[PDB]
Amino acid sequence: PAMLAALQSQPDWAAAMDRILALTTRNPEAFRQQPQANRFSAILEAVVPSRTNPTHEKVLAIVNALTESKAIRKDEAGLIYNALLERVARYNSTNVQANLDRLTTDVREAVAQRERFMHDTNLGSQVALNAFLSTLPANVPRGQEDYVSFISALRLLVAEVPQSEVYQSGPDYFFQTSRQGLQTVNLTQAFKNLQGMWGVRSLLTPNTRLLLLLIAPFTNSSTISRDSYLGHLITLYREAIGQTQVDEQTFQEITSVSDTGSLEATL
């Protein structure tokens, strides 16, 4: 967000007194040959460099930052830029003209948090979930305490699938997405229909089934035993996921050999 300001403005002096002096490597005999007008319009630069006025540049180094995180929309950085320039062209001083400098050489460096924001989704995945888990009932359900293993598999899923896995709080009911596409929106305040079977050995509306199928991959010997339903189903969903991988590769193979066809004797 700065070199995009460098690569939007500011067309050096070492590179100029490295060429006039003929200290380059590839073609030293470069500056000598130019017309004796250029060679007298580049020698009086690396002999008495001309000052500059950097405000615009680093101000453009701030706009290109805002509009890349999300404030000032892409189409408004022609009013924001003028407004910022005129503000910093009023109150300017070594005061502000520096306070910028720090802002521009910190905003491009203090981007690690932003990177973190999208590397553990600690923006709407764990802060939301670790909020929703605090809206759950007490952590002592009656039947079993396979509860905690499931509720931890949920956190692991949300933390190890950065894709989007956003956890909205679309009003009273917090709902889990499986991707920004969102074609597996399962309601996470509607598994207070699993605070039923948390411990037993057709009452699951697929919404609950959707959550089970969504996390299952991330369950191993955790939700465990023959803890009824919740146990097996998870195991059966994992088995079905493996079989689905098998059938996926099989169908690609059988359609690369060559119409419903494979879809029948696969499904």
């Binding site: 470069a30 130019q34 017309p35 250029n38």
Partner: peptide, 26 residues
């Protein structure tokens, strides 16, 4: 009628500055 004729590895008008006839300027 025959032409052939030589001189064609391109042209120079080298840079660091650009072409001749002027573009626009009596």
């Amino acid at each position: 009628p025959r032409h052939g004729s030589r001189p064609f590895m391109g042209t120079w008008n080298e840079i660091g500055t650009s072409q001749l006839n002027g573009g626009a300027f009596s």
